[PDB]
Amino acid sequence: QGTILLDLAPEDKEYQSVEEEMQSTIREHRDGGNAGGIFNRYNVIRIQKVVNKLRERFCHRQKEVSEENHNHHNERMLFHGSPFINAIIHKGFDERHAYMFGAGIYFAENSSKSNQYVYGIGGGTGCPTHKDRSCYICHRQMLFCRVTLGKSFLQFSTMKMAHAPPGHHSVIGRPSVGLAYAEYVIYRGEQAYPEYLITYQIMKPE
Ligand SMILES: Cc1ccnc2c(NC(=O)c3ccc(N4C(=O)[C@@H]5[C@H](C4=O)[C@@H]4C=C[C@H]5C4)cc3)cccc12
Ligand SMILES: [Zn+2]
């Protein structure tokens, strides 16, 4: 049937919950805003629920992970940012299209970290039209996803990895003095479901 995008109304508590998580998880980064831009809030202009009967591939894998993890799939809602959001919502996450950065699909609990990836690694060259990484005009997109972490392997760097170590299902790169915030990585596209599609703009500091 394909993906059906359902619009959430801002007066719906599901809409508010999603925006709140995004707006409150904004943190300042050490790069002076070079990658994701300079801003204190987002102008959330749209939130759509992604419906794709993907859910099954996702639920199936979740069962495998659970058996393998003492009946604990260890789900977390996390943000994802990359230049391939539209492909993802239709075809699902795919580890074959993966790219420091290893060969995994990255997620973050802080929206501002995922915003740095919207136009690519380090923000790339910025938006296609103005080639500005701090564009306040162009609409950006990011996903708030269900991520099956199962047994996570914790470490200080992930540029090295291609797969989760034995007995594990995800890799969490953590802060050193190295990273500033945690990054969650999976190596199988089916361990993540693109629950919400957020359309937004970063707003200039008032
Ligand atoms: C048709 C089609 C064409 C191109 N793509 C597709 C796709 N794509 C992913 O599922 C994907 C996106 C970004 C990363 N991906 C990350 O999450 C990390 C790195 C990376 O490449 C760098 C960027 C974000 C950070 C840093 C890894 C995987 C999924 C489904 C279809 C696709
Ligand atoms: Zn722009």
Author numbering: 1104 to 1156, 1158 to 1203, 1207 to 1284, 1286 to 1314
Q: What is written in the article reporting this PDB entry?
A:
The two highly homologous human tankyrase isoforms, TNKS1 and TNKS2, are members of the poly ADP-ribose polymerase (PARP) family of 17 proteins that share a catalytic PARP domain. So far, two different classes of potent and selective small molecule tankyrase inhibitors, 4-((3aR,4S,7R,7aS)-1,3-dioxo-3a,4,7,7a-tetrahydro-1H-4,7-methanoisoindol-2(3H)-yl)-N-(quinolin-8-yl)benzamide (IWR1) and 2-(4-(trifluoromethyl)phenyl)-7,8-dihydro-3H-thiopyrano[4,3-d]pyrimidin-4(5H)-one (XAV939), have been identified.
The crystals of the TNKS1/2 complex diffracted to 1.9 Å with synchrotron radiation. It only becomes available upon the binding of 2 and we thus refer to it as the induced pocket. This induced pocket is created by the movement of Phe1188 of the α3 helix and the D-loop, part of which is disordered in the present crystal structure, away from one another. In the crystal structure, 2 adopts a conformation in which the central phenyl is almost perpendicular to the norbornyl group and rotated by about 60° away from the plane of the amide group. There are three hydrogen bonds between 2 and TNKS1. One of the two carbonyl oxygens of the pyrrolidine dione group is hydrogen bonded to the main chain NH of Tyr1213 and the carbonyl oxygen of the amide group is hydrogen bonded to the main chain NH of Asp1198. The CH at the 6-position of the quinoline is also involved in a CH…O = C hydrogen bonding interaction with the main chain carbonyl oxygen of Gly1196.
